[PDB]
Write a protein that binds this ligand. Structure first.
Ligand SMILES: Nc1nc2c(ncn2[C@@H]2O[C@H](COP(=O)(O)OP(=O)(O)OP(=O)(O)O)[C@@H](O)[C@H]2O)c(=O)[nH]1
Ligand SMILES: [Mg+2]
Ligand SMILES: [Mg+2]
Length: 182
């Protein structure tokens, strides 16, 4: 008799949402990038002595699918709002697009702000490319500051590619889902 909770992930195209969900749920890292249209995966986790049957709702980051995405939002217990550290613009798009959308359709649902691809923070090619545009990989303090700005439940960083931090994202999201207030 496990408790069911619904998790929805949102954020810019190619920022790492599917790989995060599939590494967590299957311990596989998909090797070919296919933009998502709509999926709903199953997973299980135990948090604070509670066994949870998680539904993981994967959404399209591409704005081509903006009209379909809200079909995923009803009755959500926790949102993962993702950006990637190699893409400062993916962080800018958090307040520009993702926060207004989720506030419209998911009022009062806890949000975990998640920095994906943390393995790229030190990558020399990423650094070189961003420096040409007078940018840098997203710093932890800037991610945390965005989390405070947008009133997120928490801020966490991970790499689906190495698995660093992945378990903690889902433990914290599950705890947020369990404490959701009405
Ligand atoms: N270096 C690195 N690359 C990653 C990581 N996670 C995903 N990627 C790569 O980033 C690309 C996009 O990853 P996805 O997880 O498919 O991105 P998405 O956010 O689901 O994209 P949409 O479905 O189009 O919204 C792929 O080439 C992945 O292999 C990570 O942790 N580190
Ligand atoms: Mg995807
Ligand atoms: Mg670890």
């Amino acid at each position: 008799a496990a408790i069911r909770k619904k998790l929805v992930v949102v954020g810019d195209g190619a920022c790492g949402k599917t790989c995060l969900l599939i590494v967590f749920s299957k311990d596989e890292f998909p090797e070919v990038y296919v933009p998502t249209v709509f999926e709903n995966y199953v997973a299980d986790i135990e948090v604070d002595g509670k066994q949870v049957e998680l539904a993981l709702w994967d959404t399209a980051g591409l704005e081509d699918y903006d009209r379909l995405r809200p079909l995923s939002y009803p009755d959500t217990d926790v949102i993962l709002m993702c950006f990637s550290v190699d893409s400062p613009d993916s962080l800018e798009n958090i307040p520009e697009k993702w926060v207004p959308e989720v506030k419209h359709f998911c009022p009062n649902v806890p949000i975990i702000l998640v920095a994906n691809k943390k393995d790229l923070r030190s990558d020399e090619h990423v650094r070189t490319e961003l420096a040409r545009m007078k940018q840098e990989p997203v710093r932890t303090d800037d991610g945390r500051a965005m989390a405070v700005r947008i009133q997120a439940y928490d801020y966490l960083e991970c790499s689906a590619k190495t698995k660093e931090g992945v378990r903690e994202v889902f433990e914290t999201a599950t705890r947020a889902a369990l404490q959701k207030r009405y």
